[PDB]
C-alpha cells in the first residue's frame, strides 16, 4: 500500500526503466537512472522530468509497454492515473516524483516463475505540431 514491509523479503530485484522519446514528443524526457534495484517492495522515489523543447505548445499522451514480458501486473507504480505529461507550453519544465517497487507476487505464478527484471518501455512519440 505504497509501502510493502509485509512483503519486503530480501530479493534485491533490479529494474530497468526503458525511457524512449521521438519527434512526436519534442520534450527532454530524462530518465533519472536507466535502472535501479528494490528489495521486492522497497518504496524508492524515482522522478521523471520533461523540458518542452518545442517552440509551440505540445500535448503528451505517451504510450508504453509496462512489462519485461510475463510480469507488468507486478509493476508497483502508483495507481490513480497520475503520469501527467498531458500538455506543455514552449519551454515549460514538467517534473514529477514517482514512487516504485516490484511486487514479490512476481515470485508466485507459473507466468513469471523466473522473471525478475522489471521494465516499463516508455515511448514519448505522440504528435508535435512543430519543434
Swiss-Prot record:
Q: What is its main location?
A: membrane
Localisation per UniProt entry: Cell inner membrane
Q: Which residues lie on this side of the membrane: Periplasmic?
A: 1-131
Membrane topology, as annotated, equals: Single-pass type II membrane protein
Keywords attached to this Swiss-Prot or TrEMBL record, sorted alphabetically, are: Cell inner membrane, Cell membrane, Copper, Membrane, Signal-anchor, Transmembrane, Transmembrane helix
- In Swiss-Prot or TrEMBL terms, this protein is called Cytochrome c oxidase assembly protein CtaG
Q: Name one GO cellular component term.
A: plasma membrane
Which residues of the full-length protein are shown here? 55 to 185 of 198
Organism's domain of life? Bacteria
Extract one GO molecular function annotation from the record: copper ion binding
Q: Which family does it belong to?
A: Belongs to the COX11/CtaG family.
As for what it does, the entry says: Exerts its effect at some terminal stage of cytochrome c oxidase synthesis, probably by being involved in the insertion of the copper B into subunit I.
Q: Which GO terms describe its biological process?
A: respiratory chain complex IV assembly
Amino acid at each position: 500500500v505504497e509501502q510493502a514491509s509485509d512483503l519486503i523479503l530480501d530479493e534485491k530485484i533490479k529494474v530497468t526503466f526503458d525511457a524512449n522519446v521521438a519527434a512526436g514528443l519534442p520534450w527532454e524526457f530524462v530518465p533519472v537512472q536507466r535502472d535501479i534495484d528494490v528489495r521486492i517492495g522497497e518504496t524508492v522515489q524515482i522522478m521523471y522530468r520533461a523540458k518542452n523543447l518545442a517552440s509551440t505548445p505540445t500535448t503528451g499522451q505517451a504510450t508504453f509497454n509496462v512489462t519485461p514480458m510475463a510480469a507488468g501486473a507486478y509493476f508497483n507504480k502508483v495507481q490513480c492515473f497520475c503520469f501527467t505529461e498531458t500538455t506543455l507550453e514552449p519551454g515549460e519544465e514538467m517534473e514529477m516524483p514517482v514512487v516504485f517497487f516490484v511486487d514479490p507476487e512476481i515470485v508466485k505464478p507459473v507466468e513469471t516463475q523466473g522473471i525478475k527484471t522489471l521494465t516499463l518501455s516508455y515511448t514519448f512519440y505522440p504528435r508535435e505540431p512543430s519543434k
